[PDB]
Amino acid sequence: LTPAQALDKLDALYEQSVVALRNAIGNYITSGELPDENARKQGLFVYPSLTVTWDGSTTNPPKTRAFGRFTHAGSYTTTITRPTLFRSYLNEQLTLLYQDYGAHISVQPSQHEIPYPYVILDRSMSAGLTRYFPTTFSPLSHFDARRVDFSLARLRHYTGTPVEHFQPFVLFTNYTRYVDEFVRWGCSQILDPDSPYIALSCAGGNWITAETEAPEEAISDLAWKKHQMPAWHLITADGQGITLVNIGVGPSNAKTICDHLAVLRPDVWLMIGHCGGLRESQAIGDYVLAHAYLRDDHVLDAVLPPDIPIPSIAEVQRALYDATKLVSGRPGEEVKQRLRTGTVVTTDDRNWELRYSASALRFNLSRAVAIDMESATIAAQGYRFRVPYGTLLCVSDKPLHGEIKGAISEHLQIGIRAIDLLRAEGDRLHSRKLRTFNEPPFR
Amino acid sequence: LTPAQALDKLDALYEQSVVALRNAIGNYITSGELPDENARKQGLFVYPSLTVTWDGSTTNPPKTRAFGRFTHAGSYTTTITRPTLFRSYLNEQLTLLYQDYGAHISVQPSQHEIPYPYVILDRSMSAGLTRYFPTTFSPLSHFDARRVDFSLARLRHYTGTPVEHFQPFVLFTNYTRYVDEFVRWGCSQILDPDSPYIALSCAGGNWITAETEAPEEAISDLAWKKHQMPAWHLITADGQGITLVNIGVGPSNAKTICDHLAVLRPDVWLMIGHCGGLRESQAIGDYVLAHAYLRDDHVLDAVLPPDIPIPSIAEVQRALYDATKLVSGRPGEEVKQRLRTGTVVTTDDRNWELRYSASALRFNLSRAVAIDMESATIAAQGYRFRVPYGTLLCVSDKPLHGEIKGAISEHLQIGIRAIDLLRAEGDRLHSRKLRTFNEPPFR
Amino acid sequence: LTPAQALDKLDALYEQSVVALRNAIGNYITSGELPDENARKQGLFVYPSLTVTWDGSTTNPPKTRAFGRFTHAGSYTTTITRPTLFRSYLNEQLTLLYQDYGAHISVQPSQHEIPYPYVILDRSMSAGLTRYFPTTFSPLSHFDARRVDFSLARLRHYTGTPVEHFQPFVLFTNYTRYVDEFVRWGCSQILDPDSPYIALSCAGGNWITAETEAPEEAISDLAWKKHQMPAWHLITADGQGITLVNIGVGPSNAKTICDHLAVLRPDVWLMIGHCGGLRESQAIGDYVLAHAYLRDDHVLDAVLPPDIPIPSIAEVQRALYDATKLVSGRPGEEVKQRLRTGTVVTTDDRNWELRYSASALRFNLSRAVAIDMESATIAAQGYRFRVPYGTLLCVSDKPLHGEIKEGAISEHLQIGIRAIDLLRAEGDRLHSRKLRTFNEPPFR
Numbered sequence A, B: 001l002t003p004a005q006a007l008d009k010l011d012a013l014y015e016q017s018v019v020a021l022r023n024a025i026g027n028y029i030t031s032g033e034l035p036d037e038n039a040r041k042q043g044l045f046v047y048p049s050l051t052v053t054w055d056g057s058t059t060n061p062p063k064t065r066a067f068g069r070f071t072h073a074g075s076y077t078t079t080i081t082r083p084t085l086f087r088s089y090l091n092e093q094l095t096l097l098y099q100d101y102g103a104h105i106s107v108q109p110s111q112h113e114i115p116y117p118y119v120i121l122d123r124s125m126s127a128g129l130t131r132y133f134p135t136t137f138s139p140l141s142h143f144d145a146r147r148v149d150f151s152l153a154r155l156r157h158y159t160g161t162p163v164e165h166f167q168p169f170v171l172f173t174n175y176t177r178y179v180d181e182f183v184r185w186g187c188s189q190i191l192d193p194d195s196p197y198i199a200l201s202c203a204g205g206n207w208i209t210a211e212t213e214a215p216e217e218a219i220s221d222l223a224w225k226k227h228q229m230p231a232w233h234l235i236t237a238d239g240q241g242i243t244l245v246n247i248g249v250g251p252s253n254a255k256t257i258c259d260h261l262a263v264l265r266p267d268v269w270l271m272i273g274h275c276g277g278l279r280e281s282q283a284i285g286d287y288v289l290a291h292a293y294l295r296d297d298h299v300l301d302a303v304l305p306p307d308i309p310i311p312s313i314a315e316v317q318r319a320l321y322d323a324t325k326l327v328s329g330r331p332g333e334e335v336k337q338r339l340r341t342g343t344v345v346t347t348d349d350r351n352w353e354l355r356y357s358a359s360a361l362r363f364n365l366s367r368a369v370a371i372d373m374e375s376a377t378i379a380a381q382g383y384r385f386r387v388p389y390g391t392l393l394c395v396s397d398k399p400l401h402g403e404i405k406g407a408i409s410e411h412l413q414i415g416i417r418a419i420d421l422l423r424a425e426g427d428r429l430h431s432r433k434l435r436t437f438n439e440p441p442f443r
Numbered sequence C: 001l002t003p004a005q006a007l008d009k010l011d012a013l014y015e016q017s018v019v020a021l022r023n024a025i026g027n028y029i030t031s032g033e034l035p036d037e038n039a040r041k042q043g044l045f046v047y048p049s050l051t052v053t054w055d056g057s058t059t060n061p062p063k064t065r066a067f068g069r070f071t072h073a074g075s076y077t078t079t080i081t082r083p084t085l086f087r088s089y090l091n092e093q094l095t096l097l098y099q100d101y102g103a104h105i106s107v108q109p110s111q112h113e114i115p116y117p118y119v120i121l122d123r124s125m126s127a128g129l130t131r132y133f134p135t136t137f138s139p140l141s142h143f144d145a146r147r148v149d150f151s152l153a154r155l156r157h158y159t160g161t162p163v164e165h166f167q168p169f170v171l172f173t174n175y176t177r178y179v180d181e182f183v184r185w186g187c188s189q190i191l192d193p194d195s196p197y198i199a200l201s202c203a204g205g206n207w208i209t210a211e212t213e214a215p216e217e218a219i220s221d222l223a224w225k226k227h228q229m230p231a232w233h234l235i236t237a238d239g240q241g242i243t244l245v246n247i248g249v250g251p252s253n254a255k256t257i258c259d260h261l262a263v264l265r266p267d268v269w270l271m272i273g274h275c276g277g278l279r280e281s282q283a284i285g286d287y288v289l290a291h292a293y294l295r296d297d298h299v300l301d302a303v304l305p306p307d308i309p310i311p312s313i314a315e316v317q318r319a320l321y322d323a324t325k326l327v328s329g330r331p332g333e334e335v336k337q338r339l340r341t342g343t344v345v346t347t348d349d350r351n352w353e354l355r356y357s358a359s360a361l362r363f364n365l366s367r368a369v370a371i372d373m374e375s376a377t378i379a380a381q382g383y384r385f386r387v388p389y390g391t392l393l394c395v396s397d398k399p400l401h402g403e404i405k406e407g408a409i410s411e412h413l414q415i416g417i418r419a420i421d422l423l424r425a426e427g428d429r430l431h432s433r434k435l436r437t438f439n440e441p442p443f444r
């Protein structure tokens, strides 16, 4: 069975089950009719199952590639959802295993039923539905159908945007003004015929395009009230645009959003936000490129102990560095005056200043250069879900030197230019630094 | 007071006290005569004291330099030992503060007496000596006279080498064969009139030079029997040679040697040794460039908690990388097949294999690429003492894939070439990644 | 089946499999030929299996013996390797269970194949070998064939000595000069016709005997360069000599060496080395007999938590004490002036002095008397592997009293040797129940 064939059968089996489930739900709601146990046990409401086998024999397999590899011979399977949404991804991944290892692809109904909430009111019916309907050999991919549907639903909820509009290159900010600037620059790019950017999905619903009646409707103020972490997508025909998510504040929220965004398998996400500068030689407006993180955020301690080192992705580091040279003033070694590369402390205690003594030893021990509340969490999540990551913050205050609580446009530009550099980079973006011993074949 | 003047007064006060102490000791040994309390209380056996003051006013001070900087106005002092041995260092450091800040230098006797053992019997004398003789602002430097004398004495003991022969660029190895190769290459370089290398200090005493009668006396086999960590110095006229220390095995020993070597203020130390490859795609003989460390060595947990991130020094990382391209085969992106960049696990349990299950979770969580017993320790110590560091290991076995327990020359060459690249690098070697908030002015 | 019979069948089955494996390896290397799955599944490359059963019925079994006992009825099994090397041991152990409990012995092929590396080319073969060949009830013994072969190979590597030269009485030292003194005394004993010592296996290869051409070749200086922990064996006809291992420095190394030496089932191992004296009344050259250890070595925390008490073996303690009286002058309570019995601190931080304050509280809390870097580790390992242990250190410095870093070396080593003698004559009184676990394997 081939890639194109596998995709088509997945679409078929999936479409069939969702329709069969929607059908049964309608029947129950109108005539209190229930589905037959036999049909269900036969895959009536089941997710498609994708299996890929490898015999182990191959001339010279990709020993250096970061993804799309086999660590051993055997069968790798996974339930699948929304094949259309994941068409590109699934195609590309299956193609790599097909052409580089001559793997045996096969599709068939799984043993897992689709929870009815994902195929769609009242509350009395809620009692019956949950009673008679579905509610809530190595891994071929990181997440299974259940986990993916779970996160897609949630993404829309926190983002106020359809998941089909998310681009592979993500930018995260903890400062509102950045989206204003992003949207402005975005609309501007859409009007330029030479720019690949043809649309702008906005949190709330707005869909700005070149044929739009007064693109002022871009930023809906009501967006921040109904969505915890509003997103904005600058789309391109080939889906290689830029997504910007205003994550808000705190490690808790940073963890939450990454938990979901991870299922879309981004190519990279960068943290472009504010931070407090801890060094006297630092000036408000300066940049900090994190080369390491002092994880005082707690939120991920249980799944990733604080002593597990979270490294820097060299490719992303150069990108941020180079992009900073270009956009910010003249290049050379002069950047040093405006850019500091060092360790960033991420805390879950905004008011850490009320306890400086207790913190001072840590800052000193870590040679801390800046402090924020999202960096380490985003980076750690990137690391956990094999999503290249990077952090370039901008000093907005100097807590330790009597300057507690513009460069916005420039800062955002550095982020965007970095994206550009990484996009052209092609596959050099992905390395083996994030690969696990039991790494799934799919990227 | 000027740099040259300060150095001269330091030499004087120091020379005087050591002679005065040596004198008093001889008098006691021969005639049981004791020193007079008044003279001592007047600085008879005291170390010289170096004080540097800064008013705070200066046009535009070095805001980007890694060392020789003032974080605030005030006086910085420190006791000093062996001014001749530290002549270059002290001169350079004082010149920087003198010319860039117009700092006020001053020398005077301290309140600290030189422990008699450092200026050099039955149980009867030792009893008297320790009874009647000395026994064992902001800081201007990292270590004080007592701490420095303590380490110099120890360095000679573990190394079997005079401290005056140590060079600024250090190489560490946990494999004996590396010194054989190093000495061979070393003697070879001494015979070449175009090579800056003019001498080779050897563990045990040997001093090979171009005018030597059969330089076969180089490696004294008795060296490993009388010295725990034998060193070899390839010296140059300007003292910019290469020092190689065979550290032996274990985190304990790695910690010990660095504790002392740190007082000589090296420019950099690289770990060039063996390790176990943890990945199936790794082949014996491949190289591992550490970008992070999983500190399971324990030995430094109390002074530097395992959650404090130990970063990579970019400059050292590139030098190790480039040096690997040059020396090892052809350049390009092909290095990837021979070189893996990733996280190294340093353990204090050589037989960790006897407990794979317990370890496996850690290896996986850290994306471990290799495992040794000294790396993280050496790097952590470098970090602690502000000594740029780096690690480039060579896979000598594959514990997880059966194969358990020429390239040596190549490996060593990579280390040496890296040193060369860093030496030419000049000051770009030192960055601010290791600076503390209360960083002493002296490098 | 009887002891002698079991030994013979073990030798047979083992010899057969090793030869069968060596054969298959040769075939692959020369003709790329692979073994047949059926033969292997039939015990072609398999280790012998030793099983001992007990019905539970017996007049009056040894209720006080430290080893060779049954806690309950049932079958006890274990894979076995190098039956020749372990002939004495295996025979003695099987004899005890046979005659004291009338146990049912039986030998047969196991389900475990011998990893090819233990029966010993190039690099392009390593890939194939590891692909087509074997790579790297209740237990009858502490270690199985896999674990034993693993350690034997390693012992030779760290020691620079063939495993069959190791004696039951082991001495550990962290000071080079002790081997010089040991070898000297050793050669001397070999020349004396009244001494049971007939040979001296040396690290590196040398095999000194009475018929040797200038026994100066004893200590090969190159030994410390090619072997991390050089050993020296003073052998006797009945293999009851003394083995000396120069372990070097650190808890890591102390742990490593004991991990391997334990499979040879020593009768005892003593730590005879230097330490720092922490008491003002202590004089350089004094002795310290450890009655307890403050484990600040870390290296064994995971498998043996620091709060599990590591006790002193009374028999070993008396031997060390008496030996000290004899060798170090006259007996009586006059030893007190030269010998202090107390708690020893074992750390993995040689430069602990750089943090005295942080340590002071601990030293004080434990009534610490000395500090070193190997004792607690050696002792803990002995405890873990049921190998009687003891520590008698010699103060080489006084870190806390201005005396920071030999005739006494010879005396110290003599105390160690005399202690061994006392323990050797002690017979079985050496082994007690203080090290027995609830699920203790029948074999010593």
Ligand SMILES: Nc1ncnc2c([C@@H]3O[C@H](COP(=O)(O)O)[C@@H](O)[C@H]3O)n[nH]c12
Residues within 6 Å of the ligand: A174, A248, A249, A250, A273, A274, A275, A276, A277, A349, A350, A371, A372, A373, A374, A396, A397, A399, A405
């Ligand atoms: N001195 C400081 N301490 C902690 N967090 C921050 C920040 C960042 O700014 C945000 C905090 O916002 P407020 O400064 O409005 O409380 C956080 O998302 C955090 O990443 N800037 N300066 C900081």
Ligand SMILES: Nc1ncnc2c([C@@H]3O[C@H](COP(=O)(O)O)[C@@H](O)[C@H]3O)n[nH]c12
Residues within 6 Å of the ligand: B174, B248, B249, B250, B273, B274, B275, B276, B277, B349, B350, B371, B372, B373, B374, B396, B397, B399, B405
């Ligand atoms: N699989 C492994 N596990 C732990 N350490 C090592 C080493 C290294 O090898 C040395 C240990 O030597 P041996 O392999 O001779 O015991 C240590 O210095 C350590 O850094 N190589 N392979 C290793």
Ligand SMILES: Nc1ncnc2c([C@@H]3O[C@H](COP(=O)(O)O)[C@@H](O)[C@H]3O)n[nH]c12
Residues within 6 Å of the ligand: C174, C248, C249, C250, C273, C274, C275, C276, C277, C349, C350, C371, C372, C373, C374, C375, C396, C397, C399, C405
């Ligand atoms: N004051 C002290 N602190 C720690 N270890 C030791 C030792 C022992 O001496 C050895 C250390 O050697 P060096 O004293 O040459 O560094 C270790 O094996 C250790 O057991 N002697 N004195 C010591």
